[PDB]
Amino acid sequence: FQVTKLCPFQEKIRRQYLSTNLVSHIEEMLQTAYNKLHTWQSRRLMK
Amino acid sequence: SLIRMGFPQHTIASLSDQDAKPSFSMAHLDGNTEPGLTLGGYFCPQCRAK
Amino acid sequence: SRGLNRVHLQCRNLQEFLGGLSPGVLDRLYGHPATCLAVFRELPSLAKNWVMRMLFLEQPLPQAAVALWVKKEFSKAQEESTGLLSGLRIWHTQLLPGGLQGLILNPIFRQNLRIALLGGGKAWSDDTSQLGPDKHARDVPSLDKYAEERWEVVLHFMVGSPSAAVSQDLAQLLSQAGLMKSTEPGEPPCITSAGFQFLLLDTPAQLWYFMLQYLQTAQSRGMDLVEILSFLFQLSFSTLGKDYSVEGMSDSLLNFLQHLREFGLVFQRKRKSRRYYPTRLAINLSSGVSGAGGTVHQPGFIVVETNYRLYAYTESELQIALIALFSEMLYRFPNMVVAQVTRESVQQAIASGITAQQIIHFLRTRAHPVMLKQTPVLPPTITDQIRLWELERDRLRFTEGVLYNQFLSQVDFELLLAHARELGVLVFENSAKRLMVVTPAGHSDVKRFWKRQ
Amino acid sequence: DELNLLVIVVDANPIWWGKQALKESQFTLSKCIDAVMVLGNSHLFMNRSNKLAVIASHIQESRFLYPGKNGRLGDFFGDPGNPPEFNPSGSKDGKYELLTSANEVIVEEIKDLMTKSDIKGQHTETLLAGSLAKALCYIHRMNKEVKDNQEMKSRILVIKAAEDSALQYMNFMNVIFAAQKQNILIDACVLDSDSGLLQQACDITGGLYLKVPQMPSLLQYLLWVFLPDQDQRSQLILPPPVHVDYRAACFCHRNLIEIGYVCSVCLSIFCNFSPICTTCETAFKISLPPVLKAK
Numbered sequence: 001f002q003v004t005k006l007c008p009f010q011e012k013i014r015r016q017y018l019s020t021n022l023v024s025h026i027e028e029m030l031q032t033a034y035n036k037l038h039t040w041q042s043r044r045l046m047k
Numbered sequence: 048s049l050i051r052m053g054f055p056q057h058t059i060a061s062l063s064d065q066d067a068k069p070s071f072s073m074a075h076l077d078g079n080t081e082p083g084l085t086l087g088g089y090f091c092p093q094c095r096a097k
Numbered sequence: 098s099r100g101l102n103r104v105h106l107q108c109r110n111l112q113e114f115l116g117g118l119s120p121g122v123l124d125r126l127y128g129h130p131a132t133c134l135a136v137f138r139e140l141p142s143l144a145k146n147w148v149m150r151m152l153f154l155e156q157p158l159p160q161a162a163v164a165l166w167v168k169k170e171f172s173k174a175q176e177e178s179t180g181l182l183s184g185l186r187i188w189h190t191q192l193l194p195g196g197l198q199g200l201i202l203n204p205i206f207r208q209n210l211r212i213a214l215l216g217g218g219k220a221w222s223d224d225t226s227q228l229g230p231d232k233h234a235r236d237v238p239s240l241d242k243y244a245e246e247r248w249e250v251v252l253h254f255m256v257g258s259p260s261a262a263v264s265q266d267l268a269q270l271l272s273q274a275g276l277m278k279s280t281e282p283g284e285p286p287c288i289t290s291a292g293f294q295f296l297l298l299d300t301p302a303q304l305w306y307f308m309l310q311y312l313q314t315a316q317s318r319g320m321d322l323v324e325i326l327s328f329l330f331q332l333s334f335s336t337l338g339k340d341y342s343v344e345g346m347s348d349s350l351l352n353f354l355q356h357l358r359e360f361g362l363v364f365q366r367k368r369k370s371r372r373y374y375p376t377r378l379a380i381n382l383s384s385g386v387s388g389a390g391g392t393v394h395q396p397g398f399i400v401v402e403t404n405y406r407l408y409a410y411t412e413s414e415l416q417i418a419l420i421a422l423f424s425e426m427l428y429r430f431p432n433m434v435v436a437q438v439t440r441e442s443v444q445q446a447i448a449s450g451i452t453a454q455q456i457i458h459f460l461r462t463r464a465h466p467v468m469l470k471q472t473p474v475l476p477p478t479i480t481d482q483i484r485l486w487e488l489e490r491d492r493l494r495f496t497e498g499v500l501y502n503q504f505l506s507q508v509d510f511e512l513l514l515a516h517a518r519e520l521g522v523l524v525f526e527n528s529a530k531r532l533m534v535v536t537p538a539g540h541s542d543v544k545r546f547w548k549r550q
Numbered sequence: 551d552e553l554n555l556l557v558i559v560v561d562a563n564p565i566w567w568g569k570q571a572l573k574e575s576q577f578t579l580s581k582c583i584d585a586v587m588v589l590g591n592s593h594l595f596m597n598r599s600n601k602l603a604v605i606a607s608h609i610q611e612s613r614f615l616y617p618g619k620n621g622r623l624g625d626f627f628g629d630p631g632n633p634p635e636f637n638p639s640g641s642k643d644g645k646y647e648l649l650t651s652a653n654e655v656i657v658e659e660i661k662d663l664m665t666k667s668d669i670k671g672q673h674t675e676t677l678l679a680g681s682l683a684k685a686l687c688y689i690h691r692m693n694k695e696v697k698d699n700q701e702m703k704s705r706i707l708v709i710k711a712a713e714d715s716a717l718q719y720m721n722f723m724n725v726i727f728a729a730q731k732q733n734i735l736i737d738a739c740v741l742d743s744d745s746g747l748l749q750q751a752c753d754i755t756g757g758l759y760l761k762v763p764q765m766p767s768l769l770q771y772l773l774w775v776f777l778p779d780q781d782q783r784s785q786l787i788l789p790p791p792v793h794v795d796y797r798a799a800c801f802c803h804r805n806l807i808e809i810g811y812v813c814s815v816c817l818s819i820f821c822n823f824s825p826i827c828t829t830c831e832t833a834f835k836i837s838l839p840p841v842l843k844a845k
């Protein structure tokens with residue numbers, strides 16, 4: 001996910017009129033899946 | 048025996064006008080199951096999937 | 098249609114007749130009894146909702162609020178109500194009272210609009226006709242016979258007065274609307290082509306046009322007195338006046354009262370005074386645009402086998418003189434078997450008019466017999482035979498005109514064709530033989546253009 | 551040709567209307583009747599063959615203002631579709647004859663209701679849920695007779711003026727699903743009090759939860775927006791868009807449910823922290839509470 005999310009970041013910089021209506025639809029559900037993986041990155045307990 | 052019941056909420060995906068907003072159930076929206084041109088839908092309170 | 102399209106719809110005939118009136122008469126028309134009629138006769142919701150908008154607003158509003166009230170998906174229906182806005186002739190577009198193109202309604206009509214909806218006063222409960230506080234206390238079925246007699250006399254004038262000898266001037270009245278035709282070799286008038294359809298639906302909507310027929314002269318007759326008098330029978334029954342109309346009347350009010358009583362919408366007592374009571378047929382005038390009734394079993398039933406169309410028989414005294422007026426059928430020995438050798442009798446009536454849609458309407462819609470019991474279409478294959486009889490009268494043409502022959506060039510004859518076409522005197526042209534038919538009405542004008550070119 | 555019907559639910563609360571006049575208000579209980587005087591006349595102006603039905607909402611019952619329940623408008627109906635035994639007033643409907651008699655029944659019926667309000671039983675508030683239970687039984691009785699030829703296109707108008715009481719809010723939701731089968735529309739006209747149950751009647755059936763600001767500006771939001779014709783309401787757009795959203799949470803619990811579970815197998819939606827039963831007499835296996843309690 002660290003390298004996949006970087007691909008559209010270097011592509012939407014050439015069309016600012018279209019990139020506005022393309023960041024307010026997928027970010028709401030993507031933050032939930034990323035939050036579940038960010039906790040286990042620093043989790044040091046098996047229970 | 049059953050656990051975890053989904054309690055979604057009804058939204059309109061707009062503020063004042065429907066055509067002024069990107070409507071609901073479009074292309075870039077995560078709801079790619081039934082695409083088209085609607086006016087509103089539900090979303091999971093634990094995942095925010097419209 | 099030959100003069101009945103404006104009768105089926107009431108809100109369209111009122112807007113067309115209002116456009117050709119005097120400015121002083123329209124001022125008195127904008128009254129409180131007329132506010133409940135310009136909206137009730139309508140049907141679309143857009144034309145009826147704008148009446149409430151001009152009542153609360155005290156200042157003229159611009160067109161910006163109208164183009165925005167349709168939001169975004171409603172301007173298509175706005176163009177349909179645009180032509181109706183000029184029909185009633187009550188709004189007015191100013192210059193810029195507070196924005197751009199301010200729309201305002203006539204304040205004379207706005208004052209009387211609140212009297213019959215919100216506000217009130219006193220003169221509304223003092224004048225007769227529009228009110229007349231009086232109850233009914235007379236035998237109702239006894240007065241229903243007089244309502245049928247008023248319409249039966251009109252049928253005698255359409256045939257030729259077989260047994261009537263009344264002095265009612267109803268033959269010339271119906272001739273102005275294209276219903277009755279004067280006989281050329283004789284003197285009793287007959288009937289036109291559009292008059293046959295009136296004797297089929299039997300709707301009280303035609304009687305509304307007869308009341309406004311005398312007003313079309315525009316000489317010494319006002320509409321404010323006719324509109325306030327026509328509202329009496331529009332309130333169904335239990336709407337009288339006892340003797341209040343006797344004290345408050347004049348010579349003009351008595352003239353319109355005698356003509357309305359002979360139509361079949363109101364009954365008047367002896368000596369043309371005392372108490373008056375509206376008939377039963379006036380209820381269907383305010384209910385819808387048409388109506389049915391008059392039978393409980395429908396003994397009539399036609400035949401859908403052969404092609405001569407055996408019409409129904411044995412009913413009452415209404416269908417006896419009705420079928421003979423259509424095309425004069427035949428009858429045999431038993432209970433008047435009508436229409437049994439229809440081959441030459443129908444062609445006798447079609448020679449004086451293209452009465453093709455009235456025979457089909459009488460054959461299909463006579464008492465609703467086949468469409469209720471059977472299932473397939475009522476007419477078999479006669480739909481093509483009826484059209485053949487109408488084309489037989491198109492084989493010839495009796496018209497006069499002059500013909501111009503012997504020209505010189507071909508490009509010169511094309512210029513002359515535009516002279517008779519613009520004036521409206523051209524009938525048929527021929528560019529291959531250089532021939533043009535000109536009516537004698539404009540013969541003195543076509544000869545002048547040829548001598549100059 | 552065509553008939554219509556409008557059921558107005560007036561929240562006649564002597565407690566709320568009795569205290570509004572103290573705050574220097576010009577739209578009190580005496581002026582609330584004028585709203586029916588205008589809406590009842592504008593409805594008949596578009597079509598003289600319509601019918602009027604006004605239902606009140608008192609703190610003890612839902613009295614029928616028009617027609618009343620007394621010996622005048624109870625057994626015999628004064629509807630315009632009954633020419634016999636009713637024609638001194640039901641004959642000149644085209645002005646102020648039958649329209650005045652329609653408002654006179656409301657004034658005559660409210661006489662017995664205003665005098666029967668000794669408020670000696672402390673406070674009971676207005677049973678607002680019982681008002682809609684009487685409107686469905688009235689529109690179904692007339693529909694069975696008018697189903698032939700005619701169709702009678704009607705609506706449901708609700709005017710909210712106060713809160714609820716100790717009544718079970720489940721009864722207020724039974725009239726919502728019972729009205730969807732007949733394909734009818736339910737409205738809502740709040741004045742000061744706000745509730746989340748009345749807004750549900752406008753989202754399920756497709757109504758409109760309108761919020762009235764000041765009181766004297768009431769004739770504008772009940773004629774164009776709350777039009778019984780409901781023919782151009784899809785492209786009308788006059789009230790502001792709905793911003794807030796109130797639904798339903800737990801039944802017999804003091805928490806906002808969003809992922810919680812019921813007690814066991816019944817319908818009382820509670821929470822997820824329940825290894826055994828709660829307020830019933832059932833049981834529940836211990837094959838899931840050991841899993842949910844961990845994480």
Ligand SMILES: [Zn+2]
Nearest residue numbers: 813814816830
């Ligand atoms: Zn339980």
